[PDB]
């Protein structure tokens, strides 16, 4: 629906929507920008991610409220409404995955862009896995795993251990292990090794880079404290 708007105007409006906390608008603007067909800059990738993370995060929070109510119950209403929110969430995940597949990932040649998009792919398959119950649930989980794994392999070869996207990827892959793959020991081992290797690389960083890296290290620490 955004085909008639200039790319630069879509980007500018995404930034305005973020300031206005209008994340559905933000996501639609960034979808339109992606569909222009040009690669995304560092800042533009972050806008795309923030927009859809906020949209799907609200849907996930609602699905969890409704799923909890449904479990305490077990009329059709709670199930029906949970299913409605679930379908909407799946639609958003499918939209994001479609943007990644057509054609963000294949055009991403630099490590920073390719890891960013593969992390996104793992995340949105993870969100699909959170609600999945059918014949394809194991394949959804393995799709998340495969995307995260490719991102990890690239990040370990091409980025320093303190790189924020490498750290956030490892954080989210550890959450995948703990919550989705029922592999808490893998989750703990990944978080600990990631934290320790970043700690040993902090000395190389400027004050501003140090702030970015230690912020995500604290999230790894919070999970390790929760898990151990």
């Amino acid at each position: 629906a955004m085909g008639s708007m200039e790319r630069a105007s879509l980007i500018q409006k995404a930034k305005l929507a973020e300031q206005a906390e209008r994340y559905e608008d933000m996501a639609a603007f960034m979808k339109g920008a992606v569909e222009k067909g040009e690669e995304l800059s560092c800042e533009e990738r972050n806008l795309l991610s923030v927009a859809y993370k906020n949209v799907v995060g609200g849907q996930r929070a609602a699905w969890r409220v409704l799923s909890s109510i449904e479990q305490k119950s077990n009329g059709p209403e709670v199930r029906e409404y949970r299913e409605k929110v679930e379908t909407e969430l799946q639609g958003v995940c499918d939209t994001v995955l479609g943007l990644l597949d057509s054609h963000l990932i294949k055009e991403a040649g630099d490590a920073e862009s390719r890891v960013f998009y593969l992390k996104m792919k793992g995340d949105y398959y993870r969100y699909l896995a959170e609600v999945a119950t059918g014949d394809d649930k194991k394949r959804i989980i393995d799709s998340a795993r495969s995307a995260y794994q490719e991102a990890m392999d690239i990040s370990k070869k091409e980025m320093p251990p303190t790189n924020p996207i490498r750290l956030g990827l490892a954080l989210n892959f550890s959450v995948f292990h703990y919550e989705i793959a029922n592999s808490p020991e893998e989750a703990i081992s990944l978080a600990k090794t990631t934290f320790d290797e970043a700690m040993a690389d902090l000395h190389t960083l400027s004050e501003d880079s140090y702030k970015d890296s230690t912020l995500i290290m604290q999230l790894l620490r919070d999970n390790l404290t929760l898990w151990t």
Binding site: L171, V175, Y178
Partner: peptide, 7 residues
């Protein structure tokens, strides 16, 4: 319950 990446 655990924290995934968030800004």
């Amino acid at each position: 319950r655990p924290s995934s990446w968030r800004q």
